[PDB]
Scaffold this active site. Structure first.
Site, mmCIF file in Angstrom:
data_model
loop_
_atom_site.group_PDB
_atom_site.id
_atom_site.type_symbol
_atom_site.label_atom_id
_atom_site.label_comp_id
_atom_site.label_asym_id
_atom_site.label_seq_id
_atom_site.Cartn_x
_atom_site.Cartn_y
_atom_site.Cartn_z
ATOM 1 N N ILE C 15 0.499 -1.573 0.004
ATOM 2 C CA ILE C 15 -0.086 0.186 0.314
ATOM 3 C C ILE C 15 0.750 1.229 -0.216
ATOM 4 O O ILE C 15 0.455 2.281 -0.909
ATOM 5 C CB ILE C 15 -1.109 -0.154 1.711
ATOM 6 N N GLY C 16 1.671 1.403 0.893
ATOM 7 C CA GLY C 16 2.522 2.010 1.013
ATOM 8 C C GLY C 16 3.786 2.298 1.923
ATOM 9 O O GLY C 16 4.178 0.807 1.780
ATOM 10 N N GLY C 17 8.172 2.746 7.864
ATOM 11 C CA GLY C 17 8.213 1.974 7.366
ATOM 12 C C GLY C 17 7.718 1.053 6.269
ATOM 13 O O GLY C 17 6.693 2.301 5.583
ATOM 14 N N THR C 18 7.412 0.160 5.574
ATOM 15 C CA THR C 18 5.995 -0.263 4.595
ATOM 16 C C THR C 18 5.168 -1.125 5.316
ATOM 17 O O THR C 18 5.418 -2.260 6.164
ATOM 18 C CB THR C 18 7.574 -0.947 3.896
ATOM 19 N N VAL C 19 3.809 -0.796 4.281
ATOM 20 C CA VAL C 19 2.737 -1.388 4.805
ATOM 21 C C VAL C 19 2.117 -2.454 4.133
ATOM 22 O O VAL C 19 1.915 -1.984 2.896
ATOM 23 C CB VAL C 19 1.482 -0.272 5.176
ATOM 24 N N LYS C 31 2.426 -4.377 9.106
ATOM 25 C CA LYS C 31 3.845 -3.203 8.972
ATOM 26 C C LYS C 31 5.459 -3.492 9.409
ATOM 27 O O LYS C 31 5.511 -3.505 10.456
ATOM 28 C CB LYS C 31 3.600 -1.860 8.838
ATOM 29 N N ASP C 124 1.734 12.998 14.731
ATOM 30 C CA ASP C 124 2.292 12.532 13.984
ATOM 31 C C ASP C 124 0.459 12.396 12.841
ATOM 32 O O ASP C 124 0.592 11.964 11.757
ATOM 33 C CB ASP C 124 2.940 11.567 13.352
#
EC number: 2.7.11.1
Lengths: 281, 229, 285, 229
Positions: C15-16, C17-19, C31, C124
């Site tokens: 989808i998008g 650390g990394t997820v 994640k 955040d």
């Protein structure tokens, strides 16, 4: 730590220990005791129930939020909008489509699979402890009888049998072992839930003698009449229900095998609308 | 005033009053002039809603009539009401069908209009068939088959396989096979080939009827899966 | 304990650390890190993020489910169907009614109130870390920068400033204190969220110079143009937004005062509804 | 044959044909004999469904009439249809109301029956009020108030505070205050005290009407929260 400092919780209405709708960072459910002097037995009850909830984080377990000691002993959990499965099925007789019923089965199984995987036996699974939250998500609640399997068989001590009879397995009713509860007893209860789901009615509707049901079920004479399943009930479900309901506990499937089945039950199943034809744009 | 009669028709539609809605568009069609296609659609919605209310009542009571296998008294009562509902349903179908024979089919000047009204004629004879018993029934079934068939022929020749109207015709004609003529294999192959032919030519979809074509393709495939059960 | 024994998790799409979208007792979000050799700094990051999530159980915090170490460091949480608030507001431009927008504000505040109440500063918060789950329920996620307030001003040490600039408070940007984060910095971010909610656009749309925004916001020159709120925005919201956005952090309200004011904004608001006419008892059935 | 007319009535009800349903029970009531209470309930369901369909159509079109502030042509059209819908709605209310004056209220022999039919009379005059303008309206409002009030007096004296029927009367009478007499405070205190009085006596709930009482208590409290907005 999950102790909620006194004063923060704002108890309101009542629903049915005893359960209130309260306030603590939004709507919550509050299940505090009405006994001013908590016996050390009611105390260990509380300690144990909290102990179990603490280990649960899953979308199909009703969300434990924290506990209070000060005013009264109480357990705080998420509030649910919407009704219990009991209420849908036997009160407002909600006309769920079969794909939905299968899905409710599936989610209920999902929550149970998660509990058993962490060695929690619920011991009071029914259609009143299964909430259709926002009508879309099954949350299993009421962990007042829940327990964790001890590696030793000399720590079971003694416990007076309690629970709703329509969901009690024959071995539990008979109460012959030191510990007649098992993952399999939970499955049996889930079996009765399948029954409510696939039939629309509780078992033994012709019998209104409470002691007779306890006696006849424990003895093997009485068992749910599977012929009462509605005609749209997939054959795989009827079989799966009869399997969860087996009298010999070891003959019952466990929840992965339950999810493995129901997982393929709705996988290779046909939810169509027959009529189709041509609808207006 | 065709434009008044049409403006009331949309008012009727928003108020969910489909019999008023159907009465407006009826009198429009009767002005004898070609319907526009916003008009045509208003007529089709009205009568589909007006007839569908009777079809659904018919099915409920027809069912009660069968579940009361004497129970003669209840069955007599159910029969009578069924037949009262039928006669509303026949008046509605005859009303539409005489509009089709007298104005809409004769005035249809473009191919898409003819397929639309011939399908509609297939449809209303099919609703009469759902409900016919005995002597009537073969004639009624023949007429439904004949309208669909003509429509089907024109649409194969003139329209793109993804056209909503050609897809809808295949949908309804396949339903006629399965439900009225009890020929499931013929129904399945008619629906399968209409689906596959539209998949072969997805480039023919356009922005403004994309949605309907896509929905009908899904309905084609759902009947197939139901029928293969 | 929440360690998921290796092998159980079944990583899928990205989808998008990394997820990743994975599988573990149903759909979950995974994640995990892509660094084969986790530095002790990435390690404490992980330990800390897990530490924070463990303390959250609330319907508006995205549900932490467990963590894995073995294959690769990873955090498992509930899966969400439906989009981020960012996506609704700036991508598919969802036409929410004002009562809905107010409600999204309210829920977001509810989740933040719950975190601050347990002393967690998120650090955040934005419109991409706020998910409208099933389009009906705000779940605040991404706790990668989250931290718990230490009683002792001897643990801040040194952390390199990271985060999205459009939501960073001037004091955070300036980064003059040992610890410039506070509950109030979270409020400011929520202030920018109100901005997106009441205006439909991000702040500073005329400026595309990244360093300029950092410099002008930190300096006091630049601040959101509140005139861009849509006309249906209740006056109480505009005021509440301007208050969350105050430059002097101590002038900003905290979340109870924010949840207490939002509760009233919807109290006397212009809304339709109303019914219940001789609800046909129908004691038939 | 009162038992035939009643059996058809339930058939009508399952087929969702409430005008047939209402016609059966009407002719039952006309046989001049006291309605049973399964009968009474069948009559109430029928006419509530028959009148409610008109009320809902009225509201849709009345709304269109206001959103078309000239737009004179659309507004004239909307007005006309409104008034056509009204006159169906008045015939229905007068029909019911003459049944109440002529058979059901005179034959009511038990207190619960009188409260039920007097509430119903409050109800149908209220539906006429929703829709009256000018000269008519005060008379119509007075009659609604007077029926509810009489009912309310008898129910306070004869029935338990959790009785479904007493709760429903308080619900409807409070709705009459808020919606017809524009007196919200009076509406709120009527609903609040009916709620609180039933909470004080939960021991009076019985197995067979538990459900309705509980639902009406929830409806009382929902109106209150709406009205305090």
């Amino acid at each position: 730590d999950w102790e909620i400092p006194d004063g923060q919780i704002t108890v309101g209405q009542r629903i049915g220990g005893t359960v209130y709708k309260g306030k603590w960072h939004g709507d919550v459910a509050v299940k505090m005791l009405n006994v001013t002097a908590p016996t050390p037995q009611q105390l260990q009850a509380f300690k144990n129930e909290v102990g179990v909830l603490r280990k649960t984080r899953h979308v199909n377990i009703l969300l434990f939020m924290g506990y209070s000691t000060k005013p009264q002993l109480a357990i705080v959990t998420q509030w649910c909008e919407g009704s219990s499965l009991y209420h849908h099925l036997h009160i407002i007789e909600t006309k769920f489509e079969m794909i939905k019923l299968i899905d409710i089965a599936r989610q209920t199984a999902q929550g149970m699979d998660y509990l058993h995987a962490k060695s929690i036996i619920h011991r009071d699974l029914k259609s009143n402890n299964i909430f259709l939250h926002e009508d879309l998500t099954v949350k299993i609640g009421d962990f007042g009888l829940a327990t964790v399997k001890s590696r030793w068989s000399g720590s079971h001590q003694f416990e007076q049998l309690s629970g709703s009879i329509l969901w009690m397995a024959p071995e539990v009713i008979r109460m012959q072992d030191k510990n007649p509860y098992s993952f399999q007893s939970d499955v049996y209860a889930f079996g009765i839930v399948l029954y409510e789901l696939m039939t629309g009615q509780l078992p033994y509707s012709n019998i209104n003698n409470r002691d007779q049901i306890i006696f006849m079920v424990g003895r093997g004479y009485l068992s749910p009449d599977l012929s009462k399943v509605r005609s749209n009930c997939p054959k795989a479900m009827k079989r799966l229900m009869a399997e969860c309901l087996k009298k010999k506990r070891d003959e019952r499937p466990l929840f992965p095998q339950i999810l493995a089945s129901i997982e393929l039950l709705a996988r290779s199943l046909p939810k169509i609308h027959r009529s189709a034809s041509e609808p207006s744009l | 005033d065709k434009n008044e009669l049409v403006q009331k028709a949309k008012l009727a539609e928003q108020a969910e009053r489909y019999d008023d809605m159907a009465a407006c568009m009826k009198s429009v069609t009767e002005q004898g002039a070609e319907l526009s296609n916003e008009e045509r659609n208003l007529l089709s919605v009205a009568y589909k809603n007006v007839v569908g209310a009777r079809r659904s009542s018919w099915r409920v009571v027809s069912s009660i009539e069968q579940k009361t296998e004497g129970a003669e008294k209840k069955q007599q009562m159910a029969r009578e009401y069924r037949e009262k509902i039928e006669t509303e349903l026949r008046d509605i179908c005859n009303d539409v069908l005489s509009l089709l024979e007298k104005f809409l089919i004769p005035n249809a000047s473009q191919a898409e209009s003819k397929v639309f009204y011939l399908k509609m004629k297939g449809d209303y004879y099919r609703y009469l068939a759902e409900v016919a018993a005995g002597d009537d029934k073969k004639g009624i079934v023949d007429q439904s088959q004949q309208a669909y068939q003509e429509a089907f022929e024109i649409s194969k020749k003139e329209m793109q396989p993804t056209h909503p109207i050609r897809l809808g015709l295949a949908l309804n004609f396949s339903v006629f096979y399965y439900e009225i003529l009890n020929s499931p294999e013929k129904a399945c192959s008619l629906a399968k080939t209409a689906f596959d032919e539209a998949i072969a030519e997805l480039d023919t979809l356009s922005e403004e009827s994309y949605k309907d074509s896509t929905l009908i393709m899904q309905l084609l495939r759902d009947n197939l899966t139901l029928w293969t059960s």
